[PDB]
Amino acid sequence: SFAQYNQVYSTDAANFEHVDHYLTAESWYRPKYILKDGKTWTQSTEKDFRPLLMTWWPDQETQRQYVNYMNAQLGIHQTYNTATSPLQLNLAAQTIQTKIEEKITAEKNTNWLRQTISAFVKTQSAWNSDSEKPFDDHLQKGALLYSNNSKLTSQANSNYRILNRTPTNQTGKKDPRYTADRTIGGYEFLLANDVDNSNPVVQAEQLNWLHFLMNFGNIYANDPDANFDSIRVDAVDNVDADLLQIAGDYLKAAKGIHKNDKAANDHLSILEAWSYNDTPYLHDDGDNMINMDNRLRLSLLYSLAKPLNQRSGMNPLITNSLVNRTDDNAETAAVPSYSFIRAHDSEVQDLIRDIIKAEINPNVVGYSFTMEEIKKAFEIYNKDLLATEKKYTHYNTALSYALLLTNKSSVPRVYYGDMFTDDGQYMAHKTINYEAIETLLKARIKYVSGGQAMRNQQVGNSEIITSVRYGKGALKATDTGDRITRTSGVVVIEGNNPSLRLKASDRVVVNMGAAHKNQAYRPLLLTTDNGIKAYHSDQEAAGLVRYTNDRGELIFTAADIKGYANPQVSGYLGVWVPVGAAADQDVRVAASTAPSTDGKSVHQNAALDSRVMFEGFSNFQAFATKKEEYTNVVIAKNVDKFAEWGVTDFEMAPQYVSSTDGSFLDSVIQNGYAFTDRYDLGISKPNKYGTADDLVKAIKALHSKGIKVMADWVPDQMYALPEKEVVTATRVDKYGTPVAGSQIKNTLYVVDGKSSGKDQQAKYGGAFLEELQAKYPELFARKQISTGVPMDPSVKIKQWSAKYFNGTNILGRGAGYVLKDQATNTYFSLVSDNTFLPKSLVNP
């Protein structure tokens, strides 16, 4: 009869390991007595906690499963089938308790018991991911949505959790103005703990953090020179779009970006917003930041980079873009944008997924790779980059960069991993395209200016495109300009088919513009049998001069243009520049301080086009071995290169210390997107890129060359929060819709949902709001679109908890982990006025 001894020492909450006054399958508790060393019933002390599952079970079948399991762990030989009597099971459990206590004494610890109990727990369906099925296509197989109104978990109640309020669906109804993306333009649950960005208190906290990032130097190091200048908005299509008005309002109120282009261009901030509706929405919102040109990205991808037999026609390079470049003669383009072909995730982690799925692990889930899978995949990927026939990696990267780097009316963004290997130490190894890219970047400072014309010509058995910049001061082909128009401008010629052959009578006649009659040109880049040859000066290309005729036309023939197939080129690339630019010729233009008057902040004119963004990291960089390999230490050492390349905006990796849970790629390669503490920029320990002091130094080094530095602002989610919390939860898909056939619907669930209360969030959270409301009261007077109300700065978030989150990815804890009385279907509880405990533990 152990029931008397094992009864609870008392009903005080302090006697149990509870979470918000609920018990869980893994809760331990203090009994009245302990069977010391298996032999002597002895009054417990405060240290004498033991698992609830040693003395209590939720039903007879769970007691059987516990006995059979613990017998196997403890070398007790008997197993019990379903016909076993209640008596046999109770005796067996008491025998088990006996052995447990001999073993606690012999081994001087209870950690072993912690481990066997937790392992037992995970064998039960009600306590593992089996009761969290069916799964759905969320990246981590499912989400849990926290209930707004629940008497069981009133501390996690909310009046908000307004979901899927993307730019397209900001008002809860698809916007009728934007029709190129017919969906609702994104979805609320992406990864990990999903932050409730419709909560006005959470919105003020995202503004606090934005302000922190943009005064990072002032706040952390007292150095007005180590501040981030601009931001990237991460995962726009997964958060409430009110944040876009908040960040734009902040840029305007704090930095004056709406006053003149000099101010806007010193703080040029971008969105990562993939819906086609996001660009026109951002334009109507005031061009307070710029978005990607996703159409053009797709055209470069399918016209140039795809496997030969999947490759489209070339005309989309001209017309399938935010800007039709057939004839782009505008002083200011209709909408600003940035343009890229690959980014740290886009067309990098997808290709690693393709490799693993095809050759290594065919059941890999989403991008939840292991480090071992990644390393094996890189063996296959790095070979493929060097081959002429590529199975998995991009073709024609140089052709894509020649268009990106000469196009008018978009800021190009160069991806770090197109110049340096995607894996390996920062900047330690150059790709085979590094030299072609660097030559384009340097020629771009010197030659790329004026209006643009693109032509598509069908020739021989295929087609080419030609792309011309007329030179600084000539927006149209008829403009004559002056001396510097004459020595600037560029022509790019491309084909995308290696069997391209011209007839003997074919000509590609290219109008260079009226500044360029009767003139010597020389090659910048030519395709060759094995690669691409780069010419770094007029002299280096001295045997290869050609001329324009009376009319300002260069004319090309079969002798110049044919299709090749080599590691760099599948098709054709030729680029020519006018002879005789001075060594330091620079055709870029600085922004004006004249006041803006069109109601837009950022303007796609010659000053914005003079800019180049560099996305300065790869997800798959190796981990540093020593101080000198840290990314931020290496950026500071090589700041001269970025300036030589004309980089004007350096997009650094998010700098938050990474969590290490491994539940998704970001927290396996620790890029900085999966983090527990938003304000921990290499402060508590190094991030992947160095210490907070290395970050300070890289930002100062970039500033000493006039280069602006972008903070990646990541409001969508947080990972691996250290403290447990009980919520009332429903299994939902990535939009928040309840999953059909699930067992978890308004049922209690223990999430990892609170931050420590003692980290950088606790020090800075809400710390600037008083100052922000004094200096910029207009930020706080907007009534935000999704909620209809202003931000609410009256509460500081020093500790995150479930009330500020929409939900979480499913955790594999099971539908029944919070314990219940099966007889009455009522949760056990330790709240003092309302205590409800297993009867056999309080009244044996």
Return residues touching Ca ion (CB under 5 A): 188, 194, 238-239, 716
* d(C-alpha 426, C-alpha 210), whole Å: 27
> Whose Cβ is closer to Ca ion: residue 699's or residue 718's?
718
> Prior bond to 134 cis, omega within 30?
yes
| CA–CA gap between residue 715 and residue 804 (Å, rounded) | 12
Distance between CA atoms of residues 37 and 39, nearest Å: 5
Q: How far is the CB of 715 from Ca ion (least distance, A)?
A: 8
Q: Please report how close the Cβ of residue 182 comes to Ca ion at its closest, in angstroms.
A: 21
Nearer to Ca ion by Cβ, of 33 and 735: the residue is 735
CB-nearer residue toward Ca ion: 188 or 680: 188
Report, in Å, the least distance between residue 185 CB and Ca ion. 13
| Least gap, CB of 720 to Ca ion (angstroms) | 17
Q: Which is nearer to Ca ion, 239 or 512 (CB)?
A: 239
Q: Which is nearer to Ca ion, 197 or 368 (CB)?
A: 197
Residue 197 or 425: which CB sits closer to Ca ion?
197
Whole-number minimum distance, CB 767 to Ca ion, in Å? 25
Closer residue to Ca ion in complex, CB, 238/670: 238
Minimum separation from the CB atom of position 733 to Ca ion (A) = 13
586 by DSSP, 3-state: which? coil
Q: Rounded to the nearest whole angstrom, what is the least distance from the CB of residue 196 to Ca ion in the complex?
A: 8
Q: Which is nearer to Ca ion, 189 or 764 (CB)?
A: 189
Q: Which CB atom, from 101 or from 237, has the smaller least distance to Ca ion? A: 237
Q: Which of 822, 828, 819 is nearest to 26 (CA)?
A: 819
* Residue 435 or 716 with smaller CB distance to Ca ion: 716
- Of the pair 236, 343, the CB lying nearest Ca ion is at 236
The smaller minimum CB distance to Ca ion, of residues 198 and 452, is found at: 198
Angstrom distance (rounded) from CA 718 to CA 691: 21
Q: Is the Cβ of residue 181 or residue 240 nearer to Ca ion in the bound state? A: 240
**Count of CB atoms situated within 10 Å of the CB of 234:** 17
Pairing of strands 270-271, 230-233: parallel
Are 348 and 671 a contacting pair, CB within 8 Å?
no
CA-based diameter of the chain, in Å?
110
Could you give the CA distance from residue 527 to residue 497 in angstroms, rounded to a whole number? 13
State the minimum distance, in angstroms, from the CB of residue 794 to Ca ion: 24
SS3 state at 698: helix
CA angle 795, 793, 234 (to 5 degrees): 105
**Which residue, 238 or 621, has its beta carbon nearer to Ca ion?**
238
Q: Tell how far CA 569 is from the center of its chain.
A: 31
Query: Positive or negative, the Cα torsion across 739, 741, 742, 743?
Result: positive
- Nearest Cα neighbor of 607 from 199, 236, 265 is 265
What burial letters (b/e) apply to 402-426, b meaning 16+ CB within 10 Å? bbbbbbbbbbbbbbbbbbbbbbebb
Minimum distance from residue 242 beta carbon to Ca ion (Å): 12
* C-alpha–C-alpha distance, residues 70 and 423, integer Å: 46
Contact (Cβ atoms closer than 8 angstroms) between residue 282 and residue 273: yes
What's the number of CA atoms in the CB half-sphere (13 Å) around residue 141? 14
Nearer to Ca ion, 188 or 423 (CB): 188
Residue-wise burial string across 17-28, b where 16 or more C-beta atoms lie within 10 A, e elsewhere:
bbbbbbbbbbbb
Q: Cα–Cα distances in Å, from 236 out to 17, 188, 513, 804, 819?
A: 40, 10, 41, 18, 39
Least distance from Ca ion to the Cβ atom of residue 192, Å: 10
- CA geometry: angle at 234 spanning 765 and 641, to 5°? 105
Q: Give the residue with the Cβ less far from Ca ion, 194 or 615.
A: 194
Shortest CB 718 distance to Ca ion, Å: 11
Provide, rounded to whole angstroms, the least separation between the CB of residue 716 and Ca ion.
5
In the complex, minimum distance from the CB of residue 187 to Ca ion, in angstroms, rounded to a whole number? 8
Strand 193-195's sheet: what is its strand order? 717-718, 193-195, 805-809, 143-146, 723-732, 747-754
| Residue among 277, 405, 272, 290 at smallest CA distance from 344 | 272
Min CB(238)–Ca ion separation in Å? 4
- Pairing, β 411-415 against β 337-339: parallel
* Nearest-approach distance from CB 206 to Ca ion, in angstroms: 12
Beta carbon nearer to Ca ion, 51 or 753: 753
Task: Enumerate long-range contacts of 455-459, CB under 8 Å, 24 or more apart.
Answer: 455/318, 455/326, 455/510, 456/314, 456/315, 456/318, 457/508, 459/502, 459/503, 459/506, 459/508, 459/561
Question: C-alpha dihedral over 7, 9, 10, 14, to 10 degrees?
Answer: -120
Cα–Cα distance, 635 to 274 (Å, whole number): 29
- In angstroms, the Cα distances linking 369 to 130, 354, 361, 422, 572 are 22, 12, 9, 16, 37
Closest separation between CB of residue 138 and Ca ion, Å?
11
**Residues 111, 660, 797, 802, CA torsion sign:** negative
- The residue whose two tokens read 């499963």 is 65
Q: How far apart are CA 53 and CA 55, in angstroms?
A: 5
Least distance to Ca ion, CB of residue 770, Å: 28
Alpha-carbon distance of 405 to 118, in angstroms, equals 57
Q: What letter would DSSP give residue 201?
A: H
Q: Which one, 174 or 501, has the nearer CB to Ca ion?
A: 174
Element spanning 372, H or E: helix 371-386
Nearest approach in angstroms of CB 129 to Ca ion is 22
